[PDB]
C-alpha cells in the first residue's frame, strides 16, 4: 500500500530529526531554547510511538505528516537563532523561543488541527524576520549567554589544540600556563556582569595564550 511506504519515510525522517535535535540539545543549554528542544525531542518519540503503534493498520497519514514537517521548521528556527541572533538583545531570543514553544505545543497537541499547525509555522517564520530588526547589543552592554557562546567554543577549541599540540609536545610549565588562561576564561564565562567587550577581549587573550604555548 502507498500508506506503509509513506509511514517509513516519516519514521526515517523522525530519526534524522532525533539525531539533529540531540546535537542541538547540547548547544542550547541554559538558553531560551533548552526546554523547547526538550519538548521537541519528546515530540519526536511520541510521533514514532504513534507511527509504530499503527504500523500495519494503513490509515490517514495527513495529521501525522504535518507534525513531522513542522519539526523541520522547529529545527530551522533554532539554527536561525545560532547564525543570526547572537548579537541581539535578550528579547530577540526570548520572543523567538516563545514562538518555537508555541509550535512544539501544537505538534504535541492531539486536538491541534493541521491548519492550526501550519498557521503556527508561519507565526514562527514571521517571528524570525521580526526579531532581526531588534537592536544589537552595545559593546558596553551586559553579555548574554549567546554572547558567551563564542567564548565557550573558543575554550573547547583551545582544549583540543592543547591536548594535540602542547600536552606531550612542550614542557609541563607551558601546559600549566596555558591551563591557567583556560581556567581564567571559564571565570569570565561564569561572570554574569562581564560586558560584550570583556568577552571579546577574553577570546583574544585566550587565543594569545594558545599561541604563547605554541611558539
Ligand atoms: Cl551570562
SS3 per residue for 162-190: HHHHCCCCCCHHHHHHHHHHHHHHHHHHC
Cell numbers at 1, concatenated: 500500500
Cell output for 159: 582544549
Print burial letters for 120-152: b (CB count within 10 Å at least 16), e (below 16). bbeebeebbeebeebeebeeeeebbbbbbbebe
Alpha carbon of 140 to ligand 1 centroid (Å):
14
Quote the crossing angle between the two packed helices 196-214 and 172-189, to the nearest 10°.
170
Q: Can you tell me the distance from the alpha carbon of 183 to that of 206, in angstroms, rounded to the nearest whole number? A: 10
Quote the ligand 1 centre to 63 CA distance (angstroms): 40
Residues, CB within 5 angstroms of ligand 1 (ion)? 145, 192
As beta bridge partners, residue 88 has: 136
Q: Helices in 2-132 by DSSP H: which ranges?
A: 4-27, 34-53, 62-84, 90-108, 114-132
Instruction: Write 109-117 long-range contacts (CB < 8 A, 24+).
Output: 113/63, 114/62, 114/63, 114/66, 117/66, 117/67, 117/70
Secondary structure letter of residue 136 according to DSSP:
B
Count of CB atoms within 10 A of residue 199's CB?
22
Strand partners, 118: none
90 Cα to the center of ligand 1, angstroms:
11
Show the cell assigned to 53.
503503534
Ligand 1 midpoint to CA 122 (Å): 31
Cα of 107 to ligand 1 centre, how many Å? 31
Cα of 197 vs centre of ligand 1, distance in Å, is 13
Rounded Cα distance between 129 and 35, Å, is 22
Calculate how far, in angstroms, residue 186's C-alpha sits from the geometric centre of ligand 1: 11
Please tell me the distance between residue 153's alpha carbon and the centre of ligand 1 in angstroms.
15
Is residue 212 within 8 Å of residue 164, measured between CB atoms? no
Ligand 1 center from residue 40 Cα (angstroms):
25
Sign of CA dihedral 64, 76, 203, 142: negative
Cβ atoms of 96 and 85 within 8 Å: the answer is yes
| C-alpha distance across the termini of the chain, in Å | 66
Q: Which residue has the cell 524576520?
A: 129
The set of residues, in sequence order, having a beta carbon less than 8 Å from that of 213 and lying 6+ positions away, is 162, 166, 170, 174, 175, 177, 178
Backbone angles phi, psi at 27, to 5 degrees: -75, -20
What DSSP designation does 31 have?
S
196 alpha carbon – ligand 1 mean position (Å): 10
Residues 6+ apart with CB under 8 A from 36: 74, 78, 97, 100, 101, 104
Which experimental approach was used here? X-ray
> What is the rounded CA–CA span in Å between residue 38 and residue 147?
22
Phi-psi region of 199 (alpha: psi -120 to 50; beta: other; left: phi over 0): alpha
Place of cell 531560551: 32
Amino acid at each position: 500500500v502507498n500508506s506503509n511506504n509513506q509511514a517509513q519515510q516519516m519514521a526515517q525522517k523522525l530519526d534524522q530529526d532525533s539525531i539533529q535535535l540531540r546535537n542541538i540539545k547540547d548547544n542550547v543549554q541554559g538558553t531560551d531554547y533548552e526546554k523547547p528542544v526538550n519538548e521537541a525531542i519528546t515530540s519526536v518519540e511520541k510521533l514514532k510511538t504513534s507511527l509504530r503503534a499503527n504500523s500495519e493498520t494503513v490509515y490517514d497519514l495527513n495529521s501525522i505528516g504535518s507534525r513531522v514537517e513542522a519539526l523541520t521548521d522547529v529545527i530551522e528556527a533554532i539554527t536561525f537563532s545560532t547564525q543570526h541572533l547572537a548579537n541581539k538583545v535578550s528579547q530577540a531570543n526570548i520572543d523567538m523561543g516563545f514562538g518555537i514553544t508555541k509550535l512544539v505545543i501544537r505538534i504535541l497537541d492531539p486536538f491541534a488541527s493541521v491548519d492550526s499547525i501550519k498557521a503556527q509555522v508561519n507565526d514562527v517564520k514571521a517571528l524570525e524576520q521580526k526579531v532581526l530588526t531588534y537592536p544589537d547589543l552595545k559593546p558596553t552592554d551586559r553579555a548574554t549567554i549567546y554572547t558567551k557562546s563564542k567564548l565557550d567554543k573558543e575554550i573547547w577549541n583551545t582544549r583540543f589544540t592543547r591536548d594535540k599540540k602542547v600536552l606531550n609536545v612542550k614542557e609541563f610549565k607551558v601546559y600549566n600556563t596555558l591551563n591557567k588562561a583556560i581556567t581564567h576564561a571559564v571565570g569570565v564565562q561564569l561572570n554574569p556582569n562581564v560586558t560584550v567587550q570583556q568577552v571579546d577581549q577574553e577570546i583574544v587573550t585566550l587565543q594569545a595564550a594558545l599561541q604563547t604555548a605554541l611558539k
